[PDB]
Write a structure and sequence with these properties.
The complex is a heterotetramer, with two copies of chain A and two copies of chain B. By secondary structure, chain A is α+β, with helices and mostly antiparallel strands. Chain A has four domains: about 45 residues, no CATH class; about 240 residues, no CATH class; about 55 residues, no CATH class; about 160 residues, no CATH class. Chain A contains 24 helices and ten strands. In chain B, β12 and β13 form a beta hairpin. The chains are: A alpha+beta, B mainly beta. The complex binds magnesium ion (4 copies) and zinc ion (ZN) (2 copies). The structure holds eight DNA strands. Chains A, C: It is found in: Nucleus.
DNA sequence: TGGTTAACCATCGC
DNA sequence: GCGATGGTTAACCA
DNA sequence: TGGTTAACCATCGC
DNA sequence: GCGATGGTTAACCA
DNA sequence: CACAGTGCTACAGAC
DNA sequence: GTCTGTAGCACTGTG
DNA sequence: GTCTGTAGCACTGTG
DNA sequence: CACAGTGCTACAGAC
């Protein structure tokens, strides 16, 4: 017959509801069997191994303010809310894995592949056990429009925030004095099967009380985790690891309320640097990264305290937009996806503006503006094959950003110098497009990384020259970032778009199916099985069972 | 006594179950709000006015010399009345920050300067604390005392997160009553000394303190150790003498058993206690007029306002005194599409 | 290994995407195989023996103005719109089966069970092959909110219309002089697995142009189909069938739209009778069913021609709601689902009214109405475990009208002679519920059918006396029908609920799962696959492979 | 010769690609709303009024004598001008019904009484048709002729559903040009006799007819069989004679090729032809002044109104003359959420 | 005058 | 479509 | 006066 | 949540 | 009186 | 004595 | 000579 | 430069 684990992989990888899988199993058993598939119960006990709270492990030194028990599974995210009618309400439904246990079950999942690396690298598998380093991308995204279930209660919001992490790489260092050798480097970080769901809530991310009240313990786990080395028995030998966290693949609204900024359309645009709106439109390309987490903290402390006794606006100008207190560190960087979409919405604006001629008529009425858009979308429907979307998805963004698509707009634009202007513009943008999209720019697209700065100078001078009528005193957030800070963060991090929110947001799609297809389903246990089945979806130990190579 | 149903108009999203209404120099000010302060109100404090059934909130600018406090949800409020040196202040400590925490820093909120048209500048100065300092805690109470004739502030009650050593990532939002030690807070300088009570075997929370000359009556509040609400009423009597304060506490063992009560001053020292809860499924409908006699506190039951069905059957409710015998309560509402205003508001009045 | 068809039904009946099926197949083959499942191509080959346009059949006489070719599969529902720019647009995308071919597949697929009926009846399978009669429930429903695809075009609406049919029964009459004997009586018509999708459109259903355009051919082959008799070789013997057509399981907006009546809240509130609102409020319970298709046509001619030369309102009062011309004949009946829902929304209004006394205060402020709904839903969720809902779903409607929920809302209403008023009201209503909603009332719940009329009298004058402040000059459509025309129909049919809109509008869930996971997906090719895979889902022959004697 | 953009205010939802604007006794009337008449308009006819860039529609009540016609999409419209004893008619036949069908019942529309506030009561009398009746057809044209001195109608062009042999469930919505036979329609009584003659080898469709003094000029139609747009121009000459009519027709060597064209009567018999299409993708831009001389029709190309980008790049467009040398056109608009005005409207004017 | 307070619009990101 | 910023304009209380 | 007149309402069903 | 009916009231053209 | 699930614990019927 | 299979639970989504 | 397996196609849904 | 599908026809590699 079939091995139980292999079968279980057949199940979770093909998206099979346990009910549906029991249907199939029963059938093939009763009809010409001699059963092949293993019945539900052996599957259920076979997956005990994969889920967190299985493999025994220990940190050194022991974590500050964390439980030492390693067998703990799904926990209600409340983390002890005393549910007094008098106190803050219990409204939230949440289920999360305790961070470190999730981490070990995700990494002990890669034991085979890190052994693979150690063998392939021609390193001794027995030698150098303690010199491991592990780079991990954490991510968080809110997802609206989640149907509430009738249930027993509690009455709970229709928004759901989903929080996850992906293991990007593991590299040896010790002996020392080296680059460190990369044992494992994830091939497709932009895949949903590379993303392991950590936590599940029903909360709006604009509701700060509740969100901080759930995610607080998690962040604590992080601040502890940055120090101690992990210790796991792996591949037969007990080895010691390290952990590097990159908070990345957040949308900007989320960065700003989590990094405690004033958001998102204010006169202080950039997360990374202090430049104002008009100040940034004045000179675009030249900026240096300044603001970080520790900085945001000291800034809050000099806002809340306000030692020099400045009034509202001068104080707001001293701290450059730090009002709220940041509770979470985020490595400074630009999301590939949302920046792409942002630039595409700005270009949507520009195209709209060149349908009629809007630098000749400084303030046109709303009517012929709607008229203009209808023109633009009729055209974009004909050529480029594009439905007039409500909110702009990244797919649209990728389809409209081409020389090819810009051509469709070139047709309507009345004059030649403008028609040529936005074409030249798009060419300039596409030459700089892969640097924040492509996985590893250093190699994949070397010259476009080499020539970026000059090219952005070109672009910005095109704006300042022929497009100034729009960009006189203003420029968008993301467009600013992409015309300023790309070279810096690439030559620092080494990659961008490798760190993209793409992996995480895609995860949201899975959530929905899992909630609908693989849930209980009731408000008591839903997140239980969503989170479970999802974590079982991402596991490489099942996935290479599904490879069954060739 | 009667109620007038209110419409929230705009700005209904800035109230959350914990919050404060401070009555000083005429108009009363909403303090605390959902989330961090937005730029519509960089301070976070809102002046509130009620006209013709209409509830209105407006921004309050801060003076240059002021600090800016976070929107604390369940702070201990004490009105420090007009006298030397500077009238007249609302004392706030310490509340619970929207990014979830407890501010252990005590804020001193004063009125600074008017006019012109309905415009008041408020100044917020946190007073640094030398001690012996009190822990970060929330939902407790603080009240003003005057003894011979030196003035101080008595601090008691409340909850906190489990002590740093025993706190887990699994048990965090587990929250325990704080130890039964009062703090005598000298408002100048910041020295507030801790004091232990032979008569207090347990931490109390959401209790409601009232105060008059050198005396404070703690009206009953939730206990999380035994999960019960004591009918007993706490009386404490402080005597401030150089160089050491002497506090004595006694029990009058019959009174109201209540939690999260709205205290609205009507007469000179006589508040009406509107009041929050009987049991944890039960909310107090019966309203209690509380006078303070030098002999002792006494409470006469007042005929409760006629409750419209909604406020009668709600699970939870909250509010604060507008002052002058008038108070504001709020009932959480639900239907989809969301209301959008999560709370319906009622005005209620004596006489 | 195992049989191709059995496997094909391991897929289709378990909701398995062909790609996913291929994933699993490849895995189980490569790992310890000795392949078990059949590769995709023999599945695709196997399902050609099920889908319509397979089995050869013949009608006599020949169907008027319909093609005689029996092998035709999926047809684009356009029926060849000439797509001149100048003519009416080609905007609609549609895929339908040719009706009769669909039927013969959905029937010869019941061949096993019909022979089963013959041998079980102890009838001789060789004798009496002519006297077969088949009663079929056709249905139609609009489903809003369908995303466009970016596609090549054409521009197409975000609404879909899904038209289907279920075979309800087959009975033998000949020799003659008898009841007719029921060979096959469907056990669960309210199941989605009993409903076979016949036609699929992207069209708004309030768009009459395009709806009549695409759905026209269908109705025509209907008007032909009811006359000629079908002839099919089945069980080895060529046998002759008759067909009976019951239009049922339409929403009322759809009804009114299709018979050319006023919609839906007008002064003429009845599909099955001529009474106005006021006339219905005065005397509630006594009405005799009148309306039908043929004289609805005569009515349209009376309106359009206006032979006696009458004023607009006099003419509209004479012809009583007939302005438009009826396209399609439907049976005069009440849909179970939307009636449960509509009576429940009426009751929602009555409870809402009985919270604050609304007969004491002739009109409220809107504010205190909002207040009333707030308290109502807060309490309802408290006890009855019901979240507030934006629309009235049937499930909510079922958890709503009970003694439970009425005694839940009886806590609020302060008056104690009003309490047992609406309580006794609900008791009466519950006593009259199963008569329309049961599968076969004559059998299942005989005494409630027996006592209906008297019971509805009681209900009615309970309204007219106690509740009159609301019901003075007005009442609900559905609430009118259910207090009048239930007894008339269930002795004209034998059931109401058996004919309900459940089978069809359960089919929408399947439309969305299939389009989303079992479609192409390109705007051109998608409907083909939704429709095909769905038809394969409903097939009995594929379904009975899923127990095989449990 | 200029354009102005119009806003459709409320009710743009009742305009659809096939429709008709009838100019009689001053004000002009929209006809053929989308779908069956909603009771906001039981008639199905809308008085349309344009003021200050604003397009407005108003319900038109029907007189007691009238038959209420369905909202037919592409009927043949002919203005029957005021004379003994008729005045004054808009003749409509037959269009195609919203429930998709073809009418083949000729409606005679007329004005009856007014105002008093300048309401207009209208009356619709379908005229029964004796003799061989013109088959159900749509998108054709019909026009008025006057000869010695008897007045009649001439009917030509159009398409129809397949003849009830080729009739199919698979081929249904597929149409075909009707046979090239004109119908001479005596408006009293309902006798309409069919006629033919060799110079017509095919049915033209969506062509525009113009009528002056017993002569009718048909601008290029759309032929389906050979799927092309003849630059040939049809001229028919009818002599009405007791007791038999004589029709002789001829061709113009060259002329205009356009389908679905709008004709606005600027002068006496001279209309500016706005025009629909030169091709199955490319749509006609240049506008053509067409005068009718007794010698023969002639077309002077007029400088086309400067087009805004939208109307120039549209795939399809449609409209009708408001009259007064002024016409209304519409461009289908795409974006979501649906505007929900399915069409942007433009007014275009000559001189 | 003055600043409410609305009110609207255009900006910016989700 | 939703929430928050920011500036112009406009309603309104003194 | 008169008929809009756009509006706003509550009504009814999807 | 969208669309259509019906009547009350209120804006407005003559 | 919709129905076929929805995953899991509980407890029976089977070698 | 282990293995296997259905029932219990509250509630779904299509309206 | 039949059986089997991946590539081509345009486009998806998560933002 | 997201990714893992989405079902089907086309055409190759395999006994
Ligand atoms: Mg979000
Ligand atoms: Mg429906
Ligand atoms: Mg519908
Ligand atoms: Mg997001
Ligand atoms: Zn910057
Ligand atoms: Zn009736």
């Amino acid at each position: 017959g079939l091995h139980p684990a292999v079968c279980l992989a057949i199940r979770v990888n093909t998206f099979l509801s346990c009910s549906q899988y029991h249907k199939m199993y029963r059938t093939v058993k009763a009809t010409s069997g001699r059963q092949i598939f293993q019945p539900l119960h052996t599957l259920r006990n076979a997956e005990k191994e994969l889920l967190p709270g299985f493999h025994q492990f220990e940190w050194q030194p022991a974590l500050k303010n964390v439980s030492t028990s390693w067998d703990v599974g799904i926990i209600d995210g409340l983390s002890g809310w005393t549910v007094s009618v008098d106190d803050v309400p219990a409204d939230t439904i949440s289920r999360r894995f305790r961070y470190d246990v999730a981490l070990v079950s995700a990494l002990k999942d890669l034991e085979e592949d890190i052994m693979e690396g150690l063998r392939e690298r021609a390193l001794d598998d027995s030698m150098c056990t303690s010199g491991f380093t592990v780079v991990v991308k954490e991510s968080c995204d809110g997802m609206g429009d989640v149907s509430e279930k009738h249930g027993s209660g509690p009455a709970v919001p229709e928004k759901a925030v989903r929080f996850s992490f992906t293991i990007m790489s593991i590299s040896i260092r010790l002996e020392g004095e080296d680059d460190g050798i990369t044992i494992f480097q994830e091939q497709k970080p932009n895949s949903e099967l590379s993303c392991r769901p950590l936590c599940l809530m029903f909360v709006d991310e604009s509701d700060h009380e509740t969100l901080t009240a759930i995610l607080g313990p998690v962040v604590a786990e992080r601040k502890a985790m940055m120090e101690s080395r992990l210790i796991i028995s792996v591949g037969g030998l007990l080895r010691s690891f390290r952990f590097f966290f990159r908070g990345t693949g957040y949308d900007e609204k989320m960065v700003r309320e989590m990094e405690g900024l004033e958001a998102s359309g204010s006169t202080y645009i950039c997360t990374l640097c202090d430049s104002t709106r008009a100040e940034a439109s004045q000179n675009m390309v030249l900026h240096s990264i300044t603001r970080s987490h520790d900085e945001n903290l000291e800034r809050y402390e000099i806002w809340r305290k306000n030692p020099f006794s400045e009034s509202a606006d001068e104080l707001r100008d001293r701290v450059k937009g730090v009002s709220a207190k940041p509770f979470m560190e985020t490595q400074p960087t630009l999301d590939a996806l949302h920046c792409d979409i942002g630039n595409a919405t700005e270009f949507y604006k520009i195209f709209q503006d060149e349908i009629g001629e809007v630098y000749q008529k400084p303030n046109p009425s709303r009517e012929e503006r709607r008229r203009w858009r209808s023109t633009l979308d009729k055209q974009l429907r004909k050529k480029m094959k594009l439905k007039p979307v409500m909110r702009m998805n990244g797919n649209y963004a990728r389809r409209l950003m081409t020389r090819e698509a810009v051509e469709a707009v070139c047709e309507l634009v009345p004059s030649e110098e403008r028609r040529e202007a936005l074409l030249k513009l798009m060419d300039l943008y596409l030459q700089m497009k892969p640097v924040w999209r492509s996985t590893c720019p250093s190699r994949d697209c070397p010259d476009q990384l080499c020539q970026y700065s000059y090219n952005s100078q070109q672009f910005a001078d095109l704006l300042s020259s022929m497009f100034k009528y729009r960009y006189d005193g203003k420029i968008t957030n993301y467009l600013h970032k992409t015309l300023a800070h790309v070279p810096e963060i690439v030559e620092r991090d080494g990659s961008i778009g490798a760190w993209a929110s793409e992996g995480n947001e895609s995860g949201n799609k899975l959530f929905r199916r899992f909630r609908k297809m693989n849930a209980r389903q009731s408000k008591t246990f839903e997140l239980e099985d969503i989170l479970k089945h999802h974590w079982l979806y991402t596991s490489k130990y099942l996935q290479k069972f599904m490879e069954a190579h060739k | 006594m009667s109620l007038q149903p209110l419409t929230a108009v705009n700005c209904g999203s800035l109230v959350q179950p914990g919050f404060s209404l401070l009555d000083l120099e005429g108009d009363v000010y909403l303090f605390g709000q959902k989330g961090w302060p937005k730029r519509s109100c960089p301070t976070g404090i809102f002046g509130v006015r009620i006209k013709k059934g209409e509830l209105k909130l407006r921004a309050i600018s801060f003076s240059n010399n002021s600090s800016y406090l976070p929107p604390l949800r369940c702070p201990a409020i004490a009105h420090f009345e007009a006298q030397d040196g500077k009238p007249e202040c609302y004392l706030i400590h310490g509340g619970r920050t929207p990014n979830n925490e407890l501010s252990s820093s005590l804020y001193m909120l004063s009125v600074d300067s008017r006019g012109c048209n309905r415009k008041v500048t408020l100044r917020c100065e946190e007073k640094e604390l030398v001690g012996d300092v009190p822990s970060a805690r929330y939902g407790h109470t603080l009240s003003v005392i005057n003894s011979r004739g030196k003035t101080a502030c008595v601090l008691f009650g409340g909850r906190s997160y489990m002590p740093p050593t025993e706190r887990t990532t699994q048990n965090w939002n587990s929250v325990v009553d704080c130890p039964p030690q009062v703090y005598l807070i000298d408002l100048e300088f910041g020295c507030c000394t801790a004091h232990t009570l032979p008569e207090l075997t347990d931490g109390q929370s959401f209790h409601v303190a009232l105060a008059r000359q050198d005396c404070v009556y703690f009206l009953g509040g939730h206990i999380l150790s035994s999960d019960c609400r004591p009918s007993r009423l706490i009386r404490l009597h402080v005597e401030l003498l150089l160089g050491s304060p002497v506090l004595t506490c006694t029990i009058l063992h019959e009174g109201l058993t209540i939690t999260s009560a709205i205290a609205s001053p009507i007469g000179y020292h006589e508040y009406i206690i509107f009041g929050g809860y009987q049991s944890e499924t039960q909310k107090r409908m019966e309203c209690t007029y509380v006078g303070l006699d030098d002999v002792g506190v006494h409470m006469e039951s007042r005929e409760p306002p006629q409750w419209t069905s909604e406020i009668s059957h709600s699970r939870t409710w909250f509010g604060g005194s507008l002052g002058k015998g008038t108070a504001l309560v709020a009932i959480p509402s639900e239907g989809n599409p969301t209301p959008p205003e999560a709370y319906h508001f009622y005005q209620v009045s004596f006489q």
